[PDB]
Design a protein around this nucleic acid. Structure first.
Lengths: 95, 274, 52, 42, 114, 113, 88, 54
RNA sequence: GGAAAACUUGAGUGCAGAAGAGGAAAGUGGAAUUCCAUGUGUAGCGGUGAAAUGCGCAGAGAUAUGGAGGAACACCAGUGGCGAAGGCGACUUUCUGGUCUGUAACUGACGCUGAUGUGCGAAAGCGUGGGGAUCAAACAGGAUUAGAUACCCUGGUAGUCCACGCCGUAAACGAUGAGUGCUAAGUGUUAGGGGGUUUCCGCCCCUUAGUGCUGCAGCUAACGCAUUAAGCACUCCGCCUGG
């Protein structure tokens, strides 16, 4: 009943199956408690405009969630601050 | 955190106690207790060598580990308990290995929370890990001063110390005193601030709560004769009549510094007390 | 933050003197030379807008 | 610096002449003590 | 170390100060207006910047760092007169930046001056 | 970078065309619309043409060839001389002489002059 | 406030006849949903004072309709107190 | 329409030559476009698609 | 005025669209200030109408990286927006209040004002604890002056900030109570609604309700006010009757 669009950024200095291991924990988190992801589109490497945790590049992600609970995405907000890889994150409701 | 007593009595009037809401189990753990007889200011010769100590309430000693040795084994917390022998609370942690032991309870510590005491530990409240592996800036307590001896520093209730920087085989740290000291890098210190923060705020409000603590009353020097104290008797009340206030044994007691210099840790103190 | 080359220094200044005047540096730090009262800047901005 | 009193007491009137004299000097000095003006040249 | 560096000036409302350094800043040489016998309130002049700039630049002498690409970090009267006087030393000023600290309305500034 | 950006390209005013009733039907591909008797040159598509105009003219001078610049419209006469000197190429300001590419065995007879 | 599928549900029981929203007892019931929803919000948010005069105004618009409903038929007023719990 | 905060190219013609915001006085947009713009320019500052200063 | 009915404009709910620094709680983020640690580096820095107190050779300032912490949110930003007032300005999510527009389905005077009462109410204060970066009463010191306890400068405590209880006062001001009608126009602007057009979106056109600036009638003692009345009316409340 509510349409969310998260976007989270990971480190540039990670290898291949370290990257795709971290995206597949979150899309299970972003399916928990009746969340049922529309799709998970992934941008490539972007030269991000300034210097967070003295990095120069980032791998972006776009996951669109259709929930009614706000139980999946605040769980995402809880864990993405804990992990030192996923560097920034932002959910936004679209109406 | 604290309860105020209604003034039903003159001795109960301004007295302010501490409700024990952080305490979850009011019974000690029978295998970690130990007899603690009172040596009321008296040394092995039998005579009183520090004043103002006497008969308080009877106390058991709870053996808690200030050295944190069991590396990489998790430890759930049973309970936060009362300890008469220190200002802080204590925390009965139970290892997955099976052994039970107490640590001093940090500020935010709950039951059912795991605690790792090793070098490959996450930087969380209650975890013990060497000062090399502790990142700069975090507050920390139960600090070892020599590797293996156990934590000694910042250990009373509400005490903490923040890691300031790192020398070759030393780390800088700022004490609750305000003093900046070098502590050897291969020394433990547990992450976080130790709890029971409102211990300093009790108004014990009564001449008898002080006697239950074991604190015998202190007679002033200026109400003595001049063989009991250097501030001994004039006629009537007298001013102290000397260039400085002096102790009962004839040492100047107001302002004069008594740190014994030519000492080994003189190289390690960076900034004095603030 | 503009690089000016292939010329003299008395012409890179002419770029730089108007690449600072079209920026919030000199008019910004002259504003924050002293704390103004939180209801006198609402009139100071009103005088700097009614005159345009 | 001028001042006038039309009293008859020639000791109490000068208590008012010196009052008018002391006021007029302070007018003169604060006129010329506005040298302290922060004027920075270009 | 030869012919690569960063020149830092920050002319405040008093005492134009200049420190030339390398491209990864390590303070090669510096000079001020107070280091030229300007005791007080003569330091807030463009003429003080006419001598203070090159007397750190020409008295660097440790590596021959002869390019500058100056950086401006202060609102002052001798702001552009310290880079004009830097080509009196003649050190190929190639990138002028106004890197001044501008807050995002962060702290409380001090009182008004009556 | 590669192309002219969108801001300064239409600030010059290249989106204007000539008048409707004065139209060539083959230019339908390169017209976005007409507003008040005036046509509107497709601005996104001429960027897709000026880069292709940039691509070969890059590599013509790579061979060392000579590109001729001609301009005779009276409001664009001396805008092509000053750009040929910066390029080091050969310009035309006045009218076409009538054979300076084809009968130039009699024009170079007068460039010899 | 409350959702429309919550709001359209509560106008089914107290409706007097089909397509008669705006009736007094069908707009008191949707108030009592909105009363009970906002002071549960206000229970955990005790500092929200600007939302409190939104509550205190629609308390007043419920009271002015209960006082209205007694003036023309008392037997309908007794049924609404029993259907959804109000005092007085 | 509605400005999406990922569409950087139409969103960075509105940013300044240092990273500031052009006012609608000098750009020429409408009122409700400018403040629907400014809630999208500042979500794009937060996820490093645009700087705060250059 | 009472009673029994009937009506739809007032009032309220529907349905469909919007706009918003309206509140509350929890997260996230960047620039700057201060302090500390370090590298490199050398005599002043700082400050003023002029100086001095202060700071620095136990390496200052300046510069570069990293850290900690508190406070605010540049640009957008506007005689703009929202709220009953006080007031409200980073960003995101949750929870929640109000207004406006349009449609006419529905209820059928359900309305307005409101003594006593009951709740909100800037700052400075007070209490119990936190936290303490800048700023800063009191206070200390240096200059000015004819003189100081003022102005200016260095330093600095409560406070400024958070949580919970209070206090309940401001030039709390549009120095103008609330409600509903009616009475020349011109002109900006806001959310729209339409629109005619379109524009490469541009615009320019008619439309509720806001928000300004001009200006008749009328009003005022005069300034002035003038569809946002201080004009013409009716209701109710607060209040004044020399200093």
């Amino acid at each position: 009943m509510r349409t969310y669009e998260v976007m989270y950024i990971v480190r540039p200095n990670i290898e291949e199956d370290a990257k795709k291991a971290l995206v597949e924990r979150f899309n299970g988190i972003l399916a928990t408690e009746g969340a049922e992801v529309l799709e998970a589109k992934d941008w490539g490497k972007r030269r991000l405009a300034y210097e967070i945790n003295d990095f120069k590049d980032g791998f972006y992600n776009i996951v669109r969630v259709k929930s009614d609970n706000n139980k999946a995405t605040d769980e995402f907000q809880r864990l993405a601050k804990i992990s030192d890889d996923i560097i920034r994150y932002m959910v936004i409701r679209e109406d | 955190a604290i309860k105020k007593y209604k003034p039903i009595t003159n001795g109960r009037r301004n007295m302010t106690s501490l409700d024990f809401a952080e305490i979850t189990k009011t019974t000690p753990e029978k295998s970690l207790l130990k007899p603690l007889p009172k040596k009321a200011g008296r040394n092995n010769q039998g005579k009183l060598t520090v004043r103002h100590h006497g008969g308080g309430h009877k106390r058991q000693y709870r053996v808690i580990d200030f050295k944190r040795n069991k590396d990489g084994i998790n430890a759930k917390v049973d309970s936060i308990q009362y300890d008469p022998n220190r200002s802080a609370n204590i925390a009965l942690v139970v290892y997955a290995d099976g052994e039970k032991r107490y640590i001093i309870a940090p500020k935010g510590l709950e039951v059912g929370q795991i605690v790792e005491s090793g070098a490959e530990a996450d930087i969380k409240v209650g975890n013990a890990l060497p000062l090399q592996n502790i990142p700069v800036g975090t507050v920390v307590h139960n600090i070892e001063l020599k590797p293996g001896k156990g934590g000694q520093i910042a250990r009373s209730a509400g005490a903490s110390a923040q890691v300031l920087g790192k020398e070759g085989k030393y780390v800088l740290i700022r004490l609750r005193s305000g003093e900046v000291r070098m502590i050897l890098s291969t020394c433990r210190a547990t992450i976080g601030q130790v709890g029971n923060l409102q211990h300093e705020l009790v108004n014990v409000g009564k001449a008898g709560r002080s006697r239950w603590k074991g604190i015998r009353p202190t007679v002033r020097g200026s109400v003595m004769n001049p063989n009991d104290h250097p501030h001994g008797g004039g006629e009537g009340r007298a001013p102290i009549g000397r260039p400085s206030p002096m102790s009962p044994w004839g040492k100047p007691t107001l302002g004069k510094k008594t740190r014994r210099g030519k000492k080994s840790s003189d190289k390690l103190i960076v900034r004095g007390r603030k | 933050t503009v690089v000016r080359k292939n010329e003299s220094l008395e012409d890179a200044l002419r770029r730089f003197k108007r690449s600072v005047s079209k920026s919030g540096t000199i008019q910004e730090v002259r504003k924050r030379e002293f704390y103004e009262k939180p209801s006198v800047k609402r009139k100071k901005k009103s005088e700097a807008a009614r005159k345009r | 610096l001028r001042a006038e009193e039309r009293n008859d007491d020639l000791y109490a009137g000068i208590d008012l002449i010196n009052n008018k004299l002391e006021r007029q000097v302070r007018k003169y000095k604060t006129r010329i003590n506005r040298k302290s003006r922060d004027r920075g040249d270009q | 170390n030869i012919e690569n560096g960063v020149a830092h000036i920050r002319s405040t409302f008093n005492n134009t100060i200049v420190t030339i350094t390398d491209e990864f800043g390590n303070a090669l040489s510096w000079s001020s207006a107070g280091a030229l016998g300007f005791k007080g309130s003569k330091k807030s002049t463009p003429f003080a910047a006419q001598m203070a700039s090159e007397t750190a630049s020409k008295s660097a002498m440790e590596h021959g760092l002869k390019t500058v690409e100056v950086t401006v970090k202060g609102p002052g009267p001798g702001r552009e007169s310290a880079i004009r006087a830097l080509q009196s030393a003649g050190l190929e000023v190639t990138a002028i930046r106004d890197v001044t600290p501008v807050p995002h309305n962060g702290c409380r500034p001090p009182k008004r001056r009556r | 970078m590669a192309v002219i950006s969108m801001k300064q390209l239409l600030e010059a005013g290249v989106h204007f065309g000539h008048q409707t009733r004065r139209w060539n039907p083959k230019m339908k591909k390169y017209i976005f619309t007409e507003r008040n008797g005036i046509y509107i040159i497709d601005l996104q598509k001429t960027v897709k043409k000026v880069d292709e105009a940039y691509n070969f003219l890059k590599q013509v001078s790579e061979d060392g060839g000579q590109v001729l610049f001609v301009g005779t419209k009276k409001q664009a006469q001396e805008s092509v001389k000053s750009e040929a000197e910066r390029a080091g190429q050969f310009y035309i300001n006045q009218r076409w002489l009538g054979g300076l590419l084809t009968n130039y065995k009699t024009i170079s007879k007068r460039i010899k002059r | 406030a409350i959702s429309q599928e919550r709001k359209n549900e509560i106008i089914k029981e107290y409706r007097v006849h089909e397509t008669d929203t705006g009736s007094p007892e069908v707009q008191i019931a949707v108030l009592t949903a909105e009363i009970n929803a906002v002071n549960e919000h206000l229970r955990t948010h005790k500092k929200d004072h600007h939302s409190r005069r939104g509550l205190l105004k629609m308390v007043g618009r419920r009271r002015h309709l209960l006082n209205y409903l007694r003036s023309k038929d008392i037997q309908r007023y007794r049924e609404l107190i029993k259907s959804l719990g109000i005092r007085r | 329409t509605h400005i999406d905060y990922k569409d950087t190219e139409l969103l960075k013609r509105f940013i300044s030559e240092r990273g500031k915001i052009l006012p609608r006085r000098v750009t020429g947009t409408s009122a409700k476009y400018q403040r629907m713009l400014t809630t999208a320019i500042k979500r794009s500052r937060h996820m490093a698609l645009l700087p705060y200063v250059k």
